[model samples]
Each structure stands twice: as C-alpha cells, then as structure tokens.
Target: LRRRARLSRLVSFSASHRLHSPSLSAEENLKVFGKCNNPNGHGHNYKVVVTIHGEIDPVTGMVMNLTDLKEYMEEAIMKPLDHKNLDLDVPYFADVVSTTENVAVYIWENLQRLLPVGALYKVKVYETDNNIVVYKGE
Candidate 1:
C-alpha cells in the first residue's frame, strides 16, 4: 500500500479591497458588484486554507515543514495582500481586477511555484466565513 499523508492549514488575515472593474463606471459597479464596490471600499476577514498531499518523508514523516510553509505563505501571499487594497495596492490587479475567483487562482499560481513539487494539492480562498472559492491547480 502507498503511504500518503495530507496536511491542511487555515490562515486568516484582514484586507480592504473592492471587487470592481475599471472598465465599468461607478454607476455600473453598483449594478455589477452591488454594495461591494462602494467608493470607500470594503473589508473582508479573509481565510485561506491550503492542502498538500504526498508520501510522508521517510526521515521526518511530514509532508512539509509547517513553519517553512507558513513563511512561504506569508512572504508570497499574505504580507502584501493584508491591509491593502486589491484594486489599488496590488499592482498586478491594477489593470486586471480583483474578485473571489481571480484571487483564488492567483494564490494557486503563486503557491504552485513555491510549493514542493508533487506535494501541493489545492487552495481555498474564503471571502466570507460562509463562502469560498477553491482553486485546484492547473
């Protein structure tokens, strides 16, 4: 039998971002994103869940080091996104735009590059405690 292990962790951070489209005027934003695109911008207590699957390391018996994973996530994902505006603070989304689905994909892409090869599984971005988007790799 194959010896496989799954590691899942939940991280939470606060950010102020409005899901809006520059292509659309403020009036249109009211129609598209409803109350979310208010001029002042809104905030979300976002939660991200990362899952990894792999054969446990023969020596450590861990899929990956938890500390190292936290550092990687903080440096590559959370630090810049936390306490920032996705529409204005994050340069990549300046022209692109920000939404639950897009943010999930962005997280997945970054993690895919940084995570240990063949071990990374998926990422879930929770916009609200009740709703979330899951990005399952490319």
Candidate 2:
C-alpha cells in the first residue's frame, strides 16, 4: 500500500525595485502618482514567500524536494525580478505599471507556469508589513 504523507514549507527571498511610470513626466508623475512619483523613483524592499507542497516519498525520506523547488524558483522567480527596476527593466511590467499589487500578481502568474502540477500552494509578497498583496490566478 502507498503511504500518504503531508509536508509543506516556505522559502523566502528579498529583492528591491523602483516603481515609476515612463509615460508620465516628472511633473505629471507627481500629479498622477502623488508622492510616489519621485524623479529618482521610489524603492521597495520586496520579500517573496513561496509555499511548496507535496507528499513524502519514504524511500527518499522527503515530503518535498528542496533541490527541485529551489531550482524552479531560481529559474522562474529570482532571475526575473531581482535587483531590477520594476517600472523600466522588467519587460512584463513594461505595460502593467509597477504597483505593489501588480507586481504581486505578475510574480504569482510567472511562477505558477513553472510549478509542477499541484506543487504550488500560495504566494505571499510583502512590500511592507502594512502593505501586502497575494495572487492566485490571472
């Protein structure tokens, strides 16, 4: 008989981003984005938490494969968004605008494509303790 197992763990990583609008001039940015539209751009220390879930394989002595999980995130998450200007560098956000909520959902959808079937459970992104956004689907 196949034994059932349950285990889930979270992996966290931090990165930074600057959000601004290219279409808006400095004066217009201030008028539209308010205080956020600094000419130098506003920055956020972004933390991302990814939840992975799976059944343990007794032979492997693991409920989830850390190696596979890390590789998945490296390819899908870290390489894409880290240390880049969200408003200018990330192509995905080129049209979307770099709001905290937009960034959250973009990350969620990007990672979802790489996650194995039913492997991903949730994504929690924190721009600040008082500001957070979560996304499950498009």
Candidate 3:
C-alpha cells in the first residue's frame, strides 16, 4: 500500500571492548566471555543495520529521510563509537556487557529517539558476517 514504506540504513564502524561485568568474578567473566575477556580488550568490525517504517511522505516518498539519519548516525553514533573502547570510552557500556546483543540495544536506544515516533522497526548489529544480533525494542 502507499500508506507506508520501510527504510534501512547500513552503518559501519570499529571498536574495542572487554567483557568484564563488575557483578561477575574475573574467572566467571572469562568462563562466559572466554578470550573475549582479553586483558587488553578486543575490537570488532561492526555493522549496524537500522530499519524504520512509517507513512511515506507524499512529496518525498520516504519513511524517514536517509540523509538526516546518516548525518545523525555519523555524528552521534559513529563519532563516539568508532576507534574506541566501548567499555572504558562509551559511558553506557561501562560496567555492562558489550555483547553484540547489547550493542544492538544501544544502537536502537540511540537511534529510536532520532526518528519519527514509533517508526523504528528493527536494529541489527553484526560483529562479523556470521555473528549478529537483532532487536525490535522490548
């Protein structure tokens, strides 16, 4: 129908993280996160696929403007996230697990408010082509 359309944006970045939840013992953290708990941390070539769905703007024939979304993602999401430690650098990831699932949640939280209300449909994060997490809010 002409009533709505869905748009998705693929954004890429790189970041490092250590899985050290304060609530878990060091050994337990390693037991669960394994080598991911490397003392120096590790990085991922991350890809975020975000989808928004809503009524199409008559003249624009769009759900949400990609240019503005791209601008917001680069400035708001990529700037702080790229080439940094997710745990020590990103305040929200500190004291929490930076698993791909959590990262997807983080991406959603950051982007949802930027789009039209109720427009966000999906948030998917890829740590690698084989590994990924998908979120559709709660």
Candidate 4:
C-alpha cells in the first residue's frame, strides 16, 4: 500500500528591505510603515520553512529528496535573496512592499513551480518572534 507523508525543512538567511509603498510619499510611507520605512532600510535574520506533502516515493521513501529540495531552494530562493536588499536588488520587489506577507508569497510563487507536482504545501517566513507569515499558494 502507498503511504502519504509530509516533510519540511528550515533555513536561515539575512536580508534587508524597506516597507515603503510606491503610491505613498515619504511622509505617508513613514506614517504607515513607521520605522520599517526607514530611508536606509533595515535587516532581518529570516527563517524560512518549506513543506511538501505527497505520497512517499516507493524507491526513495521520501516525499521529496532533501538534496534536490535544498538545491532548488538555495538556487531559486536563497542565493538571490540572501544578504541582498529585497527592495532594491530583487526586481520582483521593485514596486511591491517587502513585508513578511509579501516575502512569503514570493517564496511560495518561486517554489511552487519547481517543486514536485502537487507536492509543495506551504511556505512560512519568520520575520521575528512575534511576526511570522505563512503562505499556501493562496
């Protein structure tokens, strides 16, 4: 009989971003985002959790291979984002606010396409102990 399983991995990285809205002026942005909209930006020690749910491969006994998952995550999400300024360096965030919600969504969008068919289940970003964002393709 085939069995279903879920597997998750966590990785950490550092990145900087400003929570400015393109439609808002500096004053408005400051009023809305507070210190998050600082002109010089701020950084976070982000923790990313990636989860996949699927039937375990008969041969491999895994929902998804750890090496493959790590490679894809590093290349697609970590390498480009880690240590970079999301607001200024990532083209995708050029106009979008680099909030925790947006960052989780971005990670979900990038990973869903690369993960095994119907396998990717969730992407969670921990901006801080009190601030965490979770995305499940919705």
Candidate 4 structure quality by residue, lDDT tens digits, 1-138: 789988999998899998998799878998999989778989999999999898888998988889988998997788889999998899999888899999999899888767767888889899987899989886
What ordering of candidates by lDDT runs from best to worst?
4, 3, 1, 2
For model 2, residues 14-116, the per-residue Cα lDDT tens digits are 4444456678786776788876665566666677777766666769877567787778777776787766677667788767767778877887778778877
Per-residue lDDT of 10 in model 1: 83
Candidate 2: lDDT of 114?
A: 84
Kindly report the root-mean-square deviation of model 4 from the true structure over all alpha carbons: 1.2
Pitting candidate 1 against candidate 2, the one with the higher lDDT is 1
Q: Rank the candidates by TM-score, best first.
A: 4, 3, 1, 2
Which candidate has the top score in TM-score?
A: 4
Write down the worst ten-residue block by lDDT for model 4: 110-119
Superposed model 3: Cα runs more than 4 Å off: none
Index of the highest-lDDT prediction = 4
Prediction 4 global C-alpha lDDT: 0.89
Residue by residue across 1-138, what tens digits does model 3's lDDT show?
569777888989989888778888988888998998898988889998888888888898877788977976787579879998899889998666899988988888887757667878988889999998999998
Q: List the residue pairs that clash in candidate 2.
A: 56-63
